[PDB]
Design an enzyme around this catalytic site. Structure first.
Site: not given
Ligand code: HEM
Ligand SMILES: CC(C)Cc1ccc([C@H](C)C(=O)O)cc1
Ligand code: HEM
Ligand SMILES: *[C@@H]1O[C@H](CO)[C@@H](O[C@@H]2O[C@H](CO)[C@@H](O[C@H]3O[C@H](CO)[C@@H](O)[C@H](O)[C@@H]3O)[C@H](O)[C@H]2NC(C)=O)[C@H](O)[C@H]1NC(C)=O
Ligand SMILES: *[C@@H]1O[C@H](CO)[C@@H](O[C@@H]2O[C@H](CO)[C@@H](O)[C@H](O)[C@H]2NC(C)=O)[C@H](O)[C@H]1NC(C)=O
Ligand SMILES: *[C@@H]1O[C@H](CO)[C@@H](O[C@@H]2O[C@H](CO)[C@@H](O)[C@H](O)[C@H]2NC(C)=O)[C@H](O)[C@H]1NC(C)=O
Ligand SMILES: CCCCCCCCO[C@@H]1O[C@H](CO)[C@@H](O)[C@H](O)[C@H]1O
Ligand SMILES: CCCCCCCCO[C@@H]1O[C@H](CO)[C@@H](O)[C@H](O)[C@H]1O
Ligand SMILES: CCCCCCCCO[C@@H]1O[C@H](CO)[C@@H](O)[C@H](O)[C@H]1O
Ligand SMILES: CC(C)Cc1ccc([C@H](C)C(=O)O)cc1
Ligand SMILES: *[C@@H]1O[C@H](CO)[C@@H](O)[C@H](O)[C@H]1NC(C)=O
Ligand SMILES: *[C@@H]1O[C@H](CO)[C@@H](O)[C@H](O)[C@H]1NC(C)=O
Ligand SMILES: *[C@@H]1O[C@H](CO)[C@@H](O)[C@H](O)[C@H]1NC(C)=O
Lengths: 551, 551
Positions: A353-354, A495, A357, A499, A176, A172
């Site tokens: 894709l990321y 991904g 949650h 990445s 972010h 996260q």
């Molecule tokens: C307590 C933990 C978390 C809370 C409360 C939370 C909550 C949220 C909320 C409210 C949004 C905004 C979505 C919207 O309505 O547009 C968001 C976006 C997002 N979250 Fe989570 N989230 C959490 C953990 C995580 C985790 C662990 C990841 C792992 C990668 C993640 C990835 C994302 C991504 C990639 C976005 C889009 C961000 C953006 O475009 O600005 N979140 N999250």
């Molecule tokens: C899924 C992505 C978000 C993370 C990820 C996972 C695996 C690999 C490996 C090295 C590959 O290229 O096969 C790269 C990146």
């Protein structure tokens, strides 16, 4: 309606209208020709014959540990294989970038305007007869019904790969800095104009913010000391804007590079660790360069932490996720005799894709306490109460949730899962199978093939009717996982190109940057090339607790 | 003072302080090692033995016209040679970019902040003993003395290569899309954030300006008709800001993409020609694509005009300047098997070396009139009175001034020439010989070697004392020209890398852009690949007057 609505051109050929009811496919450099770019050139025929499937390669990489043990210890061989991983993955990404939410054709506006996320596939045109183009029903299924039937968690499903909360909060925190949607403009817009790993989530997106966060002595970031422990400074002290509810105590309104990081204590945990890391590196460079001023100390430390970040993300974070016995390497030199563009533009679909949650547990277990979401959110008191050492010990031990496989999104964030669906549609995403084709995967031919089971597959069949209009985001979360793996095929094969391109595309990896003098000499260079998740915690958390991305 | 003040590291090695009075050179990938990177590796030794000098290669390219005529007719050979011209020149340019006026060390600020021009050599540190580092006197010679003694025109000296006023104003119009200094911030800052050939001087730098200039019908730009002829619209009509003196009447305040192009009727001539060309291409695309809307017509035409521009700059403009018998080629495919970065950052030194004001004549001769500078400047009445056909016929016949060789800056712009000197110093430019070494040239060992004569050389000797602190800009303008050439060695060997890198670096030259479908199909594509300065004039100027860049 638009003649390209059916997505006729295959194999990365490009579709252009040539009249009101006619299209033409541009097959340039696809390796194919014919009306739809489906007739393979000779060499292409041969290439397709010999190419292993992603699932086959994944198998090879996750078996034969004894062979890989030998390979890992032969530098030339390890370099060869990592070079191929980097180049083959990065080839799947258009660079310089092409489409975005407003442009399904290349344009100078799409190229030049950095406030857009880019698009791996162009949007479905506005006048197409169905949401996915021409297939399927006039409307997609209700997003709440999809959410409730196949995404929401019944019982917590643990990650069989053993990912822990150190991993989940690292994902996260790290992402972010480059997923920062500009909601004032819309879901297809970003506030992360550096489009990558620039550490703006530590230093601020703008110069004005950065300067408010800086001490202007010894290169360092401002900070406060509470109970003898270093924490980020406050909003009142810095005049840096943060998102906090109105009721938060002044000294708990921590101010850091990313305005949303007060949201959750797991984020503030890493914000604190990296702030300490910056100031630690300042101390080291000051020792090495008594003659340097604040500005050079600050800038050189930032470059070093960018390198540390990329190092840790490849050799700890991606290593863990991959499940491979092969030992990944962060080594810019691997690309110096390859064709590769040192630039990157963040793709909307990479953001989508990321949305991992399902990693989130039902409670956050620190020391002897089990906090609910309602207790955990915006609550930095928890961090102060337990301290960083205990945070690390507890989060290293706590298992995160499985992401693929279905029904594991915590209902506490059900609105986020629904927004990912609704916003996908608003941005006119093409279907799951169009994205699979885009990344060299075979289209799924049934819902049961997608999920590997019967019950969710039947709910999906009834909702979507045609597998070819199944949507990308819910597919990622219901997809059949690899054996005992956290992800299915579509997640990795999309991904991984995004990445690795994003990591190696950074300018510090280019030949004119990847030199000791860039980082203040051999001492600073070595900080990058020996960085790990364990050293990051060991250097900056009292007691040097053990840590890992797996339980 | 800074340990690196003397510029001790050679052959592109990088200097870092290691204490208050010690330095270390980073020789990474220079092909040299040793304290100052002056010991050649073996392969390096060999290369230095086999490498011909720039003057030798120039001699080859400008003689043996019979042999070149054959080479120019062997497609394979022409491609090979052009490819090597592109890669060898581009290799001299750091990309991703490095230094700028505020950063003599690599920094994220210098990389990311597009408001800076980049720097091919870092600035002389602020505490150095002398302006150029450690050599020369405490102060540089009075710039008014340099200007008067060796720069200012006595008799007009015509260009022996026969450059005309079509050429002089093309140079001015073309370059002023990416040389746009932000005087509010300082000489090291730019308003051209696209850093290249984006045609912002036609379409506007910002989206708001663009939309005020657009008709929003058929893809077209707004225009007016004066005496049956098409001209740019007015400031009043568009609400587009322009720089005009208060005495210019409302009807003569033409509004175009670049705010300063009302300055000279030669700029407004090209602004009108390109505006007509955009709308011409719009008509063609609309014929090919009756189904397209205004936005796609507009954007696709912009991409086509960007292509036309690069085509013409290489195969007409640079061809003319080069004096080569070899026939240059615009062909993005030449780089597709090469290592090449499709990006560029405009260098301050590129800006400085392009101050080609000696091109300007004593008077501007249109039909039977001879306009003074005072009569010509800000005077669009002159354009309306004679019309574009007469402008083209007259400027095609009128010879421009020689730029190298000394004493040919028009007195009417003496303040501009003085500013080039003064601003180079404000930006802490290194000396001429440091720049010569940076671009693989031998340092000059005397002022007479620089000028090829005695009189100017002695004045410079008295002014500067040491040839190693001679400044870049005035050296460019006094340098011994190549035989019967407009430029000396330093101009070409600095200018050619910056130029070719900037042209081929454009995303339209990248493989995912360089396809017929980018440009609306084969008809759009062919407009780029057949463009020439003559066709631009022939298609858009009543009567199709003949033209070229030579008299
Ligand atoms: C307590 C933990 C978390 C809370 C409360 C939370 C909550 C949220 C909320 C409210 C949004 C905004 C979505 C919207 O309505 O547009 C968001 C976006 C997002 N979250 Fe989570 N989230 C959490 C953990 C995580 C985790 C662990 C990841 C792992 C990668 C993640 C990835 C994302 C991504 C990639 C976005 C889009 C961000 C953006 O475009 O600005 N979140 N999250
Ligand atoms: C899924 C992505 C978000 C993370 C990820 C996972 C695996 C690999 C490996 C090295 C590959 O290229 O096969 C790269 C990146
Ligand atoms: C009648 C014709 C011209 C006039 C009146 C003129 C005048 C000027 C002036 C006043 C400046 C600003 C100098 C400063 O910063 O103080 C300038 C800059 C410049 N001129 Fe000219 N000039 C003319 C023709 C040309 C031509 C033919 C070229 C050919 C390349 C040229 C190249 C430049 C460049 C590259 C700059 C710097 C632009 C920038 O940094 O924004 N000029 N000129
Ligand atoms: C990158 O693209 C963005 C999307 O097009 C763009 O944002 C848009 O900017 C325009 C013009 O500045 C705004 O339209 C404005 O103009 C009319 C006047 O006719 C006003 O009535 C509007 O209220 C507004 O002031 C759009 O509002 C805006 N759209 C969005 C979604 O933000 C960015 O400006 C582009 N960025 C760059 C650097 O060019
Ligand atoms: C190119 O693709 C199109 C599909 O977009 C093919 O045309 C369709 O073919 C199917 C069966 O093959 C028919 O049911 C559709 O009615 C066809 N659509 C149209 C608009 O004609 C086309 O055959 C393909 N071309 C080639 C050479 O394979
Ligand atoms: C790029 O760098 C310039 C120079 O530092 C920045 O301009 C300064 O901006 C600050 C506030 O951000 C002002 O207080 C200064 O007066 C400005 N100085 C000059 C010389 O203009 C500019 O903001 C930077 N651009 C970005 C996008 O960060
Ligand atoms: C045994 C492992 C050797 C190198 C593994 C490279 C891992 C990523 O290789 C991938 O394999 C996929 C299926 O073949 C392809 O579709 C991708 O283009 C390729 O990047
Ligand atoms: C006919 C031989 C090929 C044409 C030469 C390419 C034009 C530019 O060649 C140049 O020559 C200089 C001296 O060797 C070098 O220092 C430059 O790096 C190189 O680009
Ligand atoms: C063609 C005759 C001019 C050549 C003489 C060299 C110029 C040196 O003389 C200078 O000329 C400037 C421009 O007129 C004046 O502004 C200065 O006062 C004068 O010192
Ligand atoms: C000097 C520069 C501004 C113009 C210029 C002149 C010559 C060349 C040729 C193709 C070369 O590379 O030798 C390129 C660019
Ligand atoms: C915040 O955390 C503390 C523990 O530090 C806890 O006791 C308190 O109840 C939490 N606040 C809320 C509103 O849940
Ligand atoms: C390196 O540069 C210094 C000047 O800074 C000079 O004194 C020395 O002799 C040079 N050569 C070597 C081999 O050190
Ligand atoms: C502008 O040019 C016109 C010729 O079209 C001329 O008559 C007039 O005097 C000029 N104006 C100035 C201020 O020199």
């Amino acid at each position: 309606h638009h003649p390209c609505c059916s997505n006729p051109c295959q194999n990365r050929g490009e579709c252009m209208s040539t009249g009101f009811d006619q299209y033409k496919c541009d097959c340039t450099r696809t390796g194919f020709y014919g009306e739809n770019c489906t007739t393979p050139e000779f060499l292409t025929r041969i290439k397709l014959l010999l190419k292993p499937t992603p699932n086959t390669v994944h198998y090879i990489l996750t078996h034969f540990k004894g062979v890989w043990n030998i390979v890992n210890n032969i530098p030339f061989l390890r370099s060869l294989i990592m070079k191929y991983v980097l180049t083959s993955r990065s080839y799947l990404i258009d660079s310089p970038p092409t489409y975005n939410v407003h442009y399904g054709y290349k344009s100078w506006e799409a190229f030049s305007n950095l406030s857009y996320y880019t698009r791996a596939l162009p949007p479905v045109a506005d006048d197409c007869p169905t949401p996915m183009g021409v297939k399927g029903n006039k409307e997609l299924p209700d997003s709440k019904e999809v959410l409730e039937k196949v995404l929401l968690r019944r019982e917590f499903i643990p990650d069989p790969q053993g990912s822990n909360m150190m991993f989940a909060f690292f994902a996260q925190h790290f992402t972010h800095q480059f997923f920062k949607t500009d909601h004032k403009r819309g879901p297809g817009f970003t506030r992360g104009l550096g489009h990558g790993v620039d550490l703006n989530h530590i230093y601020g997106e703008t110069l004005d913010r950065q300067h408010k966060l800086r001490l202007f002595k010894d290169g360092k970031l401002k900070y406060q000391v509470i109970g003898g422990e270093v924490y980020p400074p406050t909003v009142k002290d810095t005049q840096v804007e943060m998102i906090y509810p109105p009721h938060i105590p002044e000294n708990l309104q921590f101010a850091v590079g990313q305005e949303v990081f007060g949201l959750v204590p797991g984020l503030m945990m890493y914000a604190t660790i990296w702030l300490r890391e910056h100031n630690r590196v300042c101390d080291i460079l000051k020792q090495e360069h008594p003659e340097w001023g604040d500005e050079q100390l600050f800038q050189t430390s930032r470059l070093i932490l960018i390198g540390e970040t990329i190092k840790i993300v490849i050799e700890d974070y991606v290593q863990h996720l991959s499940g491979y016995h092969f030992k990944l390497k962060f080594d810019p030199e691997l690309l110096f005799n390859q064709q590769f563009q040192y630039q990157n533009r963040i793709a909307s679909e990479f953001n989508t894709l990321y949305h991992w949650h399902p990693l989130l547990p039902d409670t956050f277990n620190i020391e002897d306490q089990e906090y609910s979401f309602k207790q955990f959110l915006y609550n930095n008191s928890i961090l102060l109460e337990h301290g960083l050492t205990q945070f690390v010990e507890s989060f290293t031990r706590q298992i995160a949730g499985r992401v693929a496989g279905g029904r594991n999104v915590p209902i506490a964030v059900q609105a986020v899962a629904k927004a990912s669906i609704d916003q996908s549609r608003e941005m006119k995403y093409q279907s799951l199978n169009e994205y699979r084709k885009r990344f060299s995967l075979k289209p799924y031919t049934s819902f049961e093939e997608l999920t590997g089971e019967k019950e969710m597959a039947a709910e999906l069949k009834a909702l979507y009717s045609d597998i070819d209009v199944m949507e990308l985001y819910p597919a990622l979360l219901v997809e059949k996982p690899r054996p005992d793996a956290i992800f299915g095929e579509t997640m990795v094969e999309l991904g991984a190109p995004f990445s690795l391109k994003g990591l190696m595309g950074n300018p510090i990896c280019s030949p004119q940057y990847w030199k000791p003098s860039t980082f203040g000499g051999e001492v600073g260079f070595k900080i990058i090339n020996t960085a790990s998740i364990q050293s990051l915690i060991c250097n900056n958390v009292k007691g040097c607790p053990f840590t890992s991305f797996n339980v």
